[PDB]
């Protein structure tokens, strides 16, 4: 058995942007109110209240090349 | 058995943008109010209240090349 | 048995845009009010209230090339 | 007198090739025989016999840009 | 007199080759036989016999830009 | 008299090659025979016999940029 795994890649992932800007993200501008009375919990409680995990991602490129080469005998 | 795996890739994923901008994201501009009385929970509780996990993604490119080469003998 | 896997790719995925902008996203502008009284839960509770997981995605390109090359003997 | 020589060149000379090969050049494969008897030469003699100056030129690109910018006052 | 010589060059000369190869050059494979009897030369002789000055030229690119800027007052 | 020689060069001469190889040059594989009898020479003789000056040039690039900037007052 003779196996010759010789893939050739000369590819490009490219971006050109003259200017990038004037980006506004205002998550949670409104008031948050949580009133709790006489509540009962028998197991684990996870609670998130307010402004959490919000993202502003503005990469000049942000380009991705994902590649996988699997040879199984 | 003779196997010759020789794929050739000269591809391009390209983007050109003169200007990118004036982007506004206002998730949760309205008030959030949560009133709870005498409630009972016998098992696990996950609670998210307000403005969470909101995303503003403005990549100058944001281009993607995904590639997979599997050889199984 | 002789196998010659030799695909040739010279393809392009291209985008050109003069200007990209003046994008407005206002999810959850209206008031959210949640009243709960004497409720009973025998099993797990997941609760999301307000403005969650909203996305504003404005890539200058956003082009995708997805490729797969499987050889099974 | 005002002279403004401001030409803008953004040109491209591009070549893309998946594979280049299996090129065979066999000049002068046949027998060469030169029999000369009692010849007389009163002036200069230049002589080439056999297989001379043969060329195999296989550039992966071989692209050419020739440019000239002349201003005379 | 005002002379402004402000040319802008943003050019490219580009080659992309996946593979280059299997190139064969066999100049002068045939027998060469020169037989000379009683020849008379009264001036200069230049003689080349056999397999001379043959070229195999296989550049991965081989691309050229030739450029010339001249101002004469 | 005002002369402003301000040319701008941002050019590129580029080559990309996945693989370069399997190049064979066999100049003068055939037998060479030169038989001479009673020849007469009154001036200079230059003689080359066999396999001379053959070239195998295989540069990974081999790209050239030739440029000239002449200003004469």
Swiss-Prot record, chains A, B, C, D, E, F:
Q: Which residues carry this modification: N6-acetyllysine?
A: 6, 12, 16, 26, 38, 42, 64
Annotated site residues (Not glycated) in this chain: 6, 12, 16, 26, 35, 38, 65, 70
Per-repeat ranges for Tau/MAP: 1-31, 32-63
Result of changing residue 15 to F: In PIDB; markedly reduced ability of tau to promote microtubule assembly
Give the location in the cell: Cytoplasm, Cytosol; Cell membrane; Cytoplasm, Cytoskeleton; Cell projection, Axon
Q: Where is this cross-link: Glycyl lysine isopeptide (Lys-Gly) (interchain with G-Cter in ubiquitin)?
A: 6, 12, 16, 26, 38, 42, 48, 64, 70
Q: How is it modified after translation?
A: Phosphorylation at serine and threonine residues in S-P or T-P motifs by proline-directed protein kinases (PDPK1, CDK1, CDK5, GSK3, MAPK) (only 2-3 sites per protein in interphase, seven-fold increase in mitosis, and in the form associated with paired helical filaments (PHF-tau)), and at serine residues in K-X-G-S motifs by MAP/microtubule affinity-regulating kinase (MARK1, MARK2, MARK3 or MARK4), causing detachment from microtubules, and their disassembly. Phosphorylation decreases with age.
What residues bear N6,N6-dimethyllysine in this entry? 6
Residues annotated with Phosphoserine modification: 19, 47, 51
Q: Which residues are glycosylated?
A: 42, 48, 64
Tissue specificity is:
Expressed in neurons. Isoform PNS-tau is expressed in the peripheral nervous system while the others are expressed in the central nervous system.
Residues the record lists as Omega-N-methylarginine modifications? 44
Subunit field text: Interacts with MARK1, MARK2, MARK3 and MARK4. Interacts with PSMC2 through SQSTM1. Interacts with SQSTM1 when polyubiquitinated. Interacts with FKBP4. Binds to CSNK1D. Interacts with SGK1. Interacts with PIN1. Interacts with LRRK2. Interacts with LRP1, leading to endocytosis; this interaction is reduced in the presence of LRPAP1/RAP.
Q: Which disorder does the record name?
A: In Alzheimer disease, the neuronal cytoskeleton in the brain is progressively disrupted and replaced by tangles of paired helical filaments (PHF) and straight filaments, mainly composed of hyperphosphorylated forms of TAU (PHF-TAU or AD P-TAU). O-GlcNAcylation is greatly reduced in Alzheimer disease brain cerebral cortex leading to an increase in TAU/MAPT phosphorylations. Frontotemporal dementia 1: A form of dementia characterized by pathologic finding of frontotemporal lobar degeneration, presenile dementia with behavioral changes, deterioration of cognitive capacities and loss of memory. In some cases, parkinsonian symptoms are prominent. Neuropathological changes include frontotemporal atrophy often associated with atrophy of the basal ganglia, substantia nigra, amygdala. In most cases, protein tau deposits are found in glial cells and/or neurons.
Purpose of the protein? Promotes microtubule assembly and stability, and might be involved in the establishment and maintenance of neuronal polarity. The C-terminus binds axonal microtubules while the N-terminus binds neural plasma membrane components, suggesting that tau functions as a linker protein between both. Axonal polarity is predetermined by TAU/MAPT localization (in the neuronal cell) in the domain of the cell body defined by the centrosome. The short isoforms allow plasticity of the cytoskeleton whereas the longer isoforms may preferentially play a role in its stabilization.
Comment block on domains: The tau/MAP repeat binds to tubulin. Type I isoforms contain 3 repeats while type II isoforms contain 4 repeats.
Name the record gives this protein: Microtubule-associated protein tau
Span of the entire protein shown here: 623 to 695 of 758
């Amino acid at each position: 058995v003779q196996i010759v795994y010789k893939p050739v890649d000369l590819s490009k992932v490219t971006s050109k942007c003259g200017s990038l800007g004037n980006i506004h993200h205002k998550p949670g501008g409104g008031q948050v109110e949580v009133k709790s009375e006489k509540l009962d919990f028998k197991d684990r409680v996870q609670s998130k209240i307010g402004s959490l995990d919000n993202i502003t991602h503005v990469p000049g490129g942000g380009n991705k090349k994902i590649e996988t080469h699997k040879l199984t005998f």
